[PDB]
Amino acid sequence: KKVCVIGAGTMGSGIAQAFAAKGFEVVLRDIKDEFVDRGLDFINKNLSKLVKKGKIEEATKVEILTRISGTVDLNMAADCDLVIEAAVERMDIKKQIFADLDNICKPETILASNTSSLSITEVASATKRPDKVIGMHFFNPAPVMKLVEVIRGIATSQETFDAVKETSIAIGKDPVEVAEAPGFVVNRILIPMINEAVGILAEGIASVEDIDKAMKLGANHPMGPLELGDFIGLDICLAIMDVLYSETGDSKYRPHTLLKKYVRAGWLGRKSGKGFYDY
Amino acid sequence: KKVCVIGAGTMGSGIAQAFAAKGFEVVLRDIKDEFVDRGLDFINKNLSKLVKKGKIEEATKVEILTRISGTVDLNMAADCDLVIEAAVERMDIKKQIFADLDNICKPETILASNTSSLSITEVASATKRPDKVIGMHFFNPAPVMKLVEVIRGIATSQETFDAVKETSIAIGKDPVEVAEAPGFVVNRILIPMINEAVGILAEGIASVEDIDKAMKLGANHPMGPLELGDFIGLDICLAIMDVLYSETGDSKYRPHTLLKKYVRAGWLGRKSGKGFYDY
Amino acid sequence: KKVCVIGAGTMGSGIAQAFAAKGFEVVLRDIKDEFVDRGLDFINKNLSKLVKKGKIEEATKVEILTRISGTVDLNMAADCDLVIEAAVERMDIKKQIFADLDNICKPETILASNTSSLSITEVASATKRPDKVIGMHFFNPAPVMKLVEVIRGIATSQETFDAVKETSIAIGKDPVEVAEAPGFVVNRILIPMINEAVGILAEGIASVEDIDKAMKLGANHPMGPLELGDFIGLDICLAIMDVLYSETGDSKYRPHTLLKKYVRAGWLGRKSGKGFYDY
Amino acid sequence: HMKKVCVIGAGTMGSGIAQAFAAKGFEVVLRDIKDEFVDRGLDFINKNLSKLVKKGKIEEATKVEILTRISGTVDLNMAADCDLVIEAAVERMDIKKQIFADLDNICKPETILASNTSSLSITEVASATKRPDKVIGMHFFNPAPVMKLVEVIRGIATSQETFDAVKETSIAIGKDPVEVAEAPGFVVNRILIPMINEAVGILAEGIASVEDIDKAMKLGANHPMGPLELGDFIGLDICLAIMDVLYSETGDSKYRPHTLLKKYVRAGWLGRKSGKGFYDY
Amino acid sequence: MKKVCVIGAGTMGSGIAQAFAAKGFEVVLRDIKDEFVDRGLDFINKNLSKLVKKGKIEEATKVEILTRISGTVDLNMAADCDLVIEAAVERMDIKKQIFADLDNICKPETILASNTSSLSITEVASATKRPDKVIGMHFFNPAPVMKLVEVIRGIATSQETFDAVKETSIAIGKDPVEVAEAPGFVVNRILIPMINEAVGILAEGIASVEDIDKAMKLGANHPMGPLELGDFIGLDICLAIMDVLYSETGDSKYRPHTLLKKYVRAGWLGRKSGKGFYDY
Amino acid sequence: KKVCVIGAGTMGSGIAQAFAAKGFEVVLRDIKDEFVDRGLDFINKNLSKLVKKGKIEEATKVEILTRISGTVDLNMAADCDLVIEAAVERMDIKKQIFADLDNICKPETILASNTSSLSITEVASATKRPDKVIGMHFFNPAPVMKLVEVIRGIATSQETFDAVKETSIAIGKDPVEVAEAPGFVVNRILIPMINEAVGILAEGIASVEDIDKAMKLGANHPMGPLELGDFIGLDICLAIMDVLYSETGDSKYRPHTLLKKYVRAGWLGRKSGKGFYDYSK
């Protein structure tokens, strides 16, 4: 029924749009009016694009925007049935936010995090409602991508998973159940695949462009892995490999040294104008 | 030019079709008439499907079939410009055949292997022609799939590479350059991905179908890794990991114990009615 | 209920004895009279020792020996409800035995292996009743030791597992359910512990006596790890590590070089008069 | 010849160690930084002695004699004339060094300086003193009054004389010492905790249940506890920390802690002490 | 290149300064205070005096060389220099600061090089707006005599920046090699793991310290055995390099041996402490 | 003292020479007359160089050859005091030879192997005189190279070791004591250095020439690792890395895939005219 999204950045704003799009009332919290407005402006822009394409009615864009209430006040979360944290990827911030909501929110509230790399279970333990703590891992762009990885911490109750599953379906998404482990499903498979491509390039086995063509034509992938690395962001790819190696303690997942070098140069991919390809 | 394909199974016959179809004279060789004739039957069937599909006229079918001469006699390769060895077999006898071809063939002839598990360099060393020995890795089905991984043995000359590259383009393919290494590009990246999926299943992190769903929706792939494993054949997948682990000596590429158990059960995927899914 | 034990060595004989002791009619099959009679005579001696010590009455011993019929003829397994193979572990042979038994025996017959190191699943694939093949792993001495690790191949049915579980209880054993994996439970944990001790010794960290004393007093174990290795047999300990490393592909389970050296010396422990200690 | 010992850190382990010495005719000092800690340690010793009285293991008067040999304090200088000092305090290296450096200045030269640490380098601690030849590990097992094993840990500069002296003292207080050249996990932890970590791996992959793993080990290897219940008994946080040290020190992924063990610890499911680990309590 | 600034008046810095002045180049030698600069200049004066005394150069040659070296504390004196060499061993945070400051101060042509092998040149270069002009130039002690320079290219280092540094290296009598930035470059990447391996052999009682060293000297014709070499380099240094190799690669192949850790922890660092694998 | 060398190949002939130059009586055995004469020629030819460069007198050359008798009869080993096997690097054959020698030779005979790669302990176990079996690892060229790695099997006696140490000194060598382990000392350290260089090359970090120059100038080595590889032979280098990986079970010692590719090409180094460098052209 009523949802709070903590953080009005790229994912936060998209998650807010996704719920609001399906008739849910949405509180959207950030820490300065400027940041809130930036999120509302971004949603508004997305929704204009959709009206412009004839995909929705102008009245629908308005109905959706009116369902979203921006705020800088964390107490606005208190009567919400679901909170989705999409803040900065920093463990102490996660834990601080969840501990506080645990006190601010009514007992029934489910507390979810969109985190890619941090332990749901650890986050849960900072609260006295671990049974109600869960991961809800959306994919960019949140309004469009149907996949949600529903991450169960070891103490996440079946009741909590079931409600989030149903809520996920209710907003037009296709949820999958994942017991907490490093990289969940998608990143666990995909990022090492990008890291493997780096390895091939580093040893002069083939060129950036041949590696990518080989994967596109040979495995029927939409993008080649290096192109994909650039799209996701090489700093993100590296941080993910760092967590896989760190969490597993298995050198299997060691990020390649050439990857480290690209990142240290600021050659992060599309968003910096340069990565494995020049933009 | 004129080309010889050695091996009249589905890959060999397919490759011969791809050349004949582009105006090249082709000698298809296998070890007895009944293998040769089966392969020509297979090709005939393939070209028959393409008339019904509307893509070519029956006349063209006939013309394509006239360019292909079946034989048991390896001496018919003597004046060929390119010889493509496609018969899956042991290193000991592949070496013989390349050595045999080295004596038989005119000095211009390039000797190519379709292998993906054996060393191109090692095979080349059984000939006095190592600068003219090269890998040409086609993808199933050979007539339609555009990718060719052109595999350079350490002695393969730039001349030999450039000729095979241009020949590849002449038959409608999109060649990539690959220095010989374990798994080339496609397998080196793709198979460990399937192996990774096995690992996630094995630790009860997610079900078979949620793993595949997550990869299809999350990474926009047309098949999930486990479903893909069943399609390739889990025996084939295991054998590839075996090669990667054996060649690298890096336990990063260790095949998962669970994959070994599926294969020892004869649960090979589609071809046996059962793998990670049952059919 | 009627059981067949294949292999009149120490373990096979002990197994036959445990079954006979609990009311089961038992066929004991080996490849030659000499081995069969040696088996029966080992069981006689065990039972006579128990009489002498006053644990069983003479008439109990006589009844027990009556329930065991020695034979060299595998067709005597034909109507047994359970067959337990306890011959020496060579996959090619074990597969032959299991295939033969598959044709000889009635369809209800469950086929069990006492192997510690060969794949139950792979053995099962040699038969047309993979759902009736299973591991039953006994501990020396079988008449005395309570544990049975019941090893499910990936195709072993619930019904087959439930029947073996009940039978184990019926013979006064305490079965545990183990999905097939390298080392099952006990060896998977115990041998690497012995291997670890060897490493400590090899780096001069502590003496043989102090390593074993530390573990006895510190972990409340009845034998220290090196003693235990000597008791089990160092050749046996090394073969298990070899299997763990070979199946996992994880160098976590590499056997220590010092252990290899002891075994190559013939310094196997108690059975040779010398291992980590002198006997 | 040692007859006066100072124990530093009045927790479970330090108080157990003070009691083991007090019970065997040493003059014992027990130091902590706050009287509250000291008093609590005394209460803990009082309590274990009372349980022995009540079991009929010892007379009440014996208990009163034992308690009299122990003098609590917060003044570090009370260690000055001790023949032996056993530090059993916080496991943080920089503070441990400071303690040992101060003891080095405070103590007569004959005084042997020991640590009960399981995780930190004796060699490294010794290097903060001018008496590295007289620094040593004396690793006790909980409960210290009952368990006979002591792992006597030699730093690379520990002298034969220092070891001999600690060896014969251990034998004098009724303990059974073993000699261990410093390395990660000494003997017991180095072998035992990886057994526990291995059980977690078996569990994680659905190979067998918690109860079946433990039964298999108890019956199959003739152990009194299974690895998973033993982890719960030791404390899964303690188990994870040790694995962490083994992996960190060796740099060998052979000793990587299982990811599932990490998840139990992160949940606060530490075993008996939290009412939940691999089993419910 | 006419004018070079060397930052750091320690042994390494002063040595590099000397090598440049000896070959005709004008040099600015910079450090943090006058005492250090003067110490460095006295060190150089002494080296050159040794060369005069042994008959390698004439007194007037020594004087000429010394006059090409100007000493300072002020980093602004590097502004018109064509090459800057940051010699002092730094923390990453300070290094980045220094390079960022040089980037703002110097004329746009100036190439900014680092002698310091432990840190990523690519990472340092990202602290400036001239990453194309940031490079590694790794000398060997003593820098006036040792011919080898490992010229380390950051991933953004331009062909023009490398070519200039290669040419300058040859102009000062050195023998440069090209190295793409990677952990341990060439020399340390091969050499230090060899020492580490020796330690593993020692730890398992396979052979004694002396027999290990004898074996390598006589069997592989090495000038020093691995264990005495460890002592000469400094075992703390050796450990720190293995730490970097393991940390950067993430491969257990390069794990420092636990016995090496114990020697360092004891303060038994080798010659510099009077004791390592040998007693000095 | 009488010595028997099994194998008149490069190493055996060299070893035989080294013993006869120091006054020992030598029996040199191979399986055909042709191979014996080949060995004796090779020795004669080496000694002729030592004369024609004034290193020894013509009379010394003759004395030396006189102390050597070629044979095809293994029974000529029977009364020798030391047998050195330098035949063929196959475990079955070493076992076979040593089993037979154990029966043929008098009880006092010490049985030594020149093997680089095979277990001394295992070879010794095919005899009933394991206390008398040992490794004597010579370096090419055996007559010149001073180092000998004396390899103790786990059963090799102190007596046997000291005898072989004394004999090693007596023939003007500098022996070192090595407890059996993969690669002994020299190869265990040296070959992975070469393997490491290969990895630097494979990743485009530096060229062949620059790698070797870096090592020569930077480490004061006479040869760089890649040219050293070519000199030793890349097949030999790969076979050693294979043994290290095989015996240790540790990926630390995995041979680089690039090395494997060079060897498969027949680019083995100097012996084939091409390895990391071009020699023949």
Ligand SMILES: NC(=O)c1ccc[n+]([C@@H]2O[C@H](COP(=O)([O-])OP(=O)(O)OC[C@H]3O[C@@H](n4cnc5c(N)ncnc54)[C@H](O)[C@@H]3O)[C@@H](O)[C@H]2O)c1
């Ligand atoms: N970006 C992606 O593609 C992606 C994909 C999947 C998951 N995630 C996860 O989502 C999170 C990152 O989201 P993003 O990419 O939108 O980041 P972002 O930097 O775009 O937005 C973060 C926002 O959080 C706000 N914030 C910081 N502290 C806060 C607090 N205490 N309360 C409320 N708001 C606060 C910031 O002001 C900022 O607007 C991470 O946890 C990441 O793991 C991101």
Ligand SMILES: NC(=O)c1ccc[n+]([C@@H]2O[C@H](COP(=O)([O-])OP(=O)(O)OC[C@H]3O[C@@H](n4cnc5c(N)ncnc54)[C@H](O)[C@@H]3O)[C@@H](O)[C@H]2O)c1
């Ligand atoms: N060549 C080297 O530089 C080198 C270096 C280190 C160690 N080794 C060791 O030396 C041994 C041999 O090397 P090599 O270079 O002399 O080989 P080689 O092939 O030059 O000579 C081997 C000789 O052994 C003979 N032989 C085979 N079986 C025999 C038998 N039963 N009795 C007597 N002779 C027999 C052969 O006829 C041949 O003449 C190997 O064990 C090898 O590991 C050699």
